[PDB]
Design a binder for this molecule. Structure first.
Ligand SMILES: [Cu+2]
Length: 125
């Protein structure tokens, strides 16, 4: 069955300022991911060329509870549009072995983002 996972958007979390909690999401195809802003001023958006081929781009409105359906297997890098430069990202691993994860780790992106992205990848390891 399809499960729903809740992800929160916070000004301050345990890992720092401007975060997605959790920042790492393990899901199966057909799962929904619900993005919930706790504080005002956050949204969720897929980052260009950081979702698997076949997946559709999306961008939520600020403060709305966004329901994302993941169909394609692989890795999804998401961001909060206004705080992406501050490291506000979340990774969604749908299925096993996202082949595009390598491509997501190497893609050009803010240095503070790379730090968080790597750290979540190591913790999931
Ligand atoms: Cu934000």
């Amino acid at each position: 069955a399809s499960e729903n996972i809740e992800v929160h958007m916070l000004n301050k979390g345990a890992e720092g300022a401007m975060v997605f909690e959790p920042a790492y999401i393990k899901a199966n195809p057909g799962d929904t991911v619900t993005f919930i802003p706790v504080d005002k001023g956050h949204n969720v958006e897929s980052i260009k060329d950081m979702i698997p081929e076949g997946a559709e781009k999306f961008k939520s409105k600020i403060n709305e509870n966004y329901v994302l359906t993941v169909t394609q297997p692989g890795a999804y890098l998401v961001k909060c549009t206004p705080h992406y430069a501050m490291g506000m990202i979340a990774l969604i691993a749908v299925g096993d072995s996202p082949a595009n994860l390598d491509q997501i780790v190497s893609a050009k992106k803010p240095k503070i983002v790379q730090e968080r992205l790597e750290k979540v990848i190591a913790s999931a390891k």
